[PDB]
Design an enzyme around this catalytic site. Structure first.
Site, short mmCIF file in Angstrom:
data_model
loop_
_atom_site.label_atom_id
_atom_site.label_comp_id
_atom_site.label_asym_id
_atom_site.label_seq_id
_atom_site.Cartn_x
_atom_site.Cartn_y
_atom_site.Cartn_z
N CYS A 131 -15.02 3.89 -28.33
CA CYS A 131 -16.30 4.55 -28.53
C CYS A 131 -17.08 4.67 -27.21
O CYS A 131 -18.11 3.99 -26.98
CB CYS A 131 -17.11 3.83 -29.62
N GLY A 137 0.76 -1.25 0.00
CA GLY A 137 0.00 0.00 0.00
C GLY A 137 0.79 1.29 0.00
O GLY A 137 0.19 2.37 -0.11
#
Lengths: 398, 403
Positions: free
Chosen positions: B331, B227
């Site tokens: 798209c 992390g």
């Protein structure tokens, strides 16, 4: 009955979920999970709904919704065209036997190679997204000794041009020797349940059509795009192609109409079967952990989209239904009311046939799901389940 | 100097961007775009920073960040372990030469086959996510005549158990004859730039360790997770492994257990850059669009997280800067790499470098719109290896061909 509103080929028989006469429990046991299961007759019926409502129109399947070549071929055999946005979609349409005169190429995903292939293929029309694209297509067509047929995409955010500045693009295009101007295109949105905006949008297109016709342009095609929404939520009432045709009838014109449905053909055609792995509580919150994740179906995770989830076997809780992916955002449903399920049992995720497998990845080294097509009691494996080797194959002995 | 803050192997040489002495423009012209480019020495040095900071710890690479087997092999050769979350990552770790004695298995991504394979492989430790998983692992281990070594994942989301209730799970697990309780696990979050929370988090784990040791448990491993964040934004200041070691030194002096760390992003993130070629420029009202050949299909983080990735030209040309949307081929309205971003005016055919793309980049890449995924290349001191060939259309649909 709610189930059949989603897909009329779905039914419970003696507490067992069936699609087109085949048990989903048997399909899950036989082909494994996660499993994408598609209804052949749903797909045919939805395509035919467009043909019945718009008998003189070209119906171009929007390949973006689902690229399975067996599904594209199914539509191709009914006379479907192909609305493509890439060279890979061109390849697929061609493979499926859709002829170039029924292929239109939209979007901004247009490299030199992709455009060369499409011009050389003599597709029906490029739905053009920029002036630079006009110049590029003109150069390419010139080098091939061919004409590129064009429409300007007009908006009645990276896409299209304001319809009020569109005539300017048409005039610019008219000056380029290797372009043939043949159409107008709009695509006003997606998942549209209230079809009201289509009337104003098409009004403006036809107004532009008349203006260009008076200006001496020969506009052969009016491509009014796709975007018809489908039933996702229980309360959703989806429009039918006939509703759209009724709405636009007194507006529609000598030009051939093209429509580009994707979601309205494929969406409710496919369901995702997933097996319950673990149940866990954290405080008062309940989690149902399944074998399918955002890697299989990403919509809930990234759009907060609703997909209806039902048990494959009905029997006598509010929960997060979550997947295997190591992300807090990897869920299929949040705070969702469902009948209590146990380890080993199957759930069906509805409305998973469009933008489902199409957006599936290999995150966490997870092979993608098998895909099966069902047709009146018969079964066809239309995509094998991947293995680990497939994911990393392009890195092997290279 | 900004670029070196991202990756000190990056530099401009006479207006041209280089990584480890290799021109990005040449790589783009040679291998095509989109192109993922990785620095071998960056990866090695990030890993070694952890080793130097925590010399007695097992450093388990979090395979979720990037699964390229050549990159995983690279770390494995340095003595890295593997933090895995699936049977596929197990396969990958093993193929890359990482021994199961250095493999830990986290997450809720644990089907019967995956669990069977890992138990059979005799991995170091399962980081357990539920009580039902305890029962399942116990059943599977019994069936194989083996033992499964476990830790409970504690939360000092679907993950972990309240640390205040973890002792009840340890008591429950002690009664399962095919499990061997060997660890405690915590993974507190991701992209952590201010490391302050690690102190309290690890303090809770140390207290749990003391309590379990008093109760008679033999806790051999304390896996304190990954992390640590990396520099994404120009103003970001990333922590070093040595900063974490400094923060935790006195706390960890309380324990005899071997410490396990699970870094992913902090090793891979700035190791990789994405090269893309400009296809079109388009103005629409007051907006400038720079349309490129890489999209959310290649790097999804901007689209789905509104994540910031720094984007620079491969060629600097002393031009005016413009505010632009840098958008891809897909798209979707949401297919962008950056919005309203300042960038040198670039033209069709020019290449851009998207920084900080080595972690959760290719790993989340899809085939949306039937787009083959990018080639991957690994640069080391002026030379290059192709570490993933560019896909073709046939590859995307191969499982549908002929049955």
């Amino acid at each position: 009955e709610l189930l059949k509103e989603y897909n009329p080929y779905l039914e419970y028989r003696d507490g067992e979920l069936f699609i087109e006469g085949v048990s989903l429990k048997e399909l899950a046991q036989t082909f494994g999970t996660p499993l994408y299961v598609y209804s052949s007759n749903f797909i045919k019926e939805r395509f035919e709904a467009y043909r019945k409502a718009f008998p003189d129109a070209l119906i171009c399947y929007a390949v973006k919704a689902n690229f399975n070549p067996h599904l594209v071929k199914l539509l191709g055999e009914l006379g479907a065209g192909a609305d493509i946005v890439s060279g890979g979609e061109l390849y697929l349409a061609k493979k499926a036997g859709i002829p170039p005169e029924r292929i239109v190429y939209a979007g901004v995903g247009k490299t030199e190679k992709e455009l060369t292939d499409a011009v050389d293929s003599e597709i029906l029309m490029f739905n053009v997204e920029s002036r630079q694209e006009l110049d590029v297509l003109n150069e390419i067509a010139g080098k091939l000794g061919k004409k590129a047929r064009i429409a300007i995409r007009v908006n009645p955010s990276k896409f299209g041009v304001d319809i009020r500045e569109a005539q300017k693009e048409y005039e610019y295009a008219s000056k380029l020797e290797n372009l043939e101007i043949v159409g107008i295109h709009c695509h006003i949105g997606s998942q549209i349940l209230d079809i009201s905006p289509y009337r104003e949008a098409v009004e403006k297109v036809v107004s532009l059509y008349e203006s260009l016709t008076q200006k001496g342009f020969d506009i052969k095609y009016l491509d009014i795009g796709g975007g018809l929404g489908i039933k996702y939520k229980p309360e959703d009432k989806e429009p039918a192609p006939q509703d759209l045709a009724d709405l636009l009838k007194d507006l529609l014109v000598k030009a051939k109409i093209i429509l580009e449905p994707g979601r309205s053909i494929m969406g409710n055609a496919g369901i995702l079967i997933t097996q319950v792995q673990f149940l866990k509580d954290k405080g008062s919150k309940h989690f149902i952990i399944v074998d399918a994740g955002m890697n299989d179906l990403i919509r809930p995770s990234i759009y907060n989209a609703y997909h209806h989830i039902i048990p494959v076997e009905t029997k006598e809780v509010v929960a997060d239904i979550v997947g295997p992916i190591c992300e807090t955002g990897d869920f299929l449903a949040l705070d969702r009311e469902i009948e209590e399920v146990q380890r080993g049992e199957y759930l069906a995720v509805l409305s998973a046939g469009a933008y489902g497998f199409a957006m599936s990845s290999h995150y966490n080294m997870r092979p993608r799901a098998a895909e099966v097509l069902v047709e009146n009691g018969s079964v066809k494996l239309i995509r094998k389940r991947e293995n680990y080797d497939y994911i990393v194959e392009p890195s092997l002995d290279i």
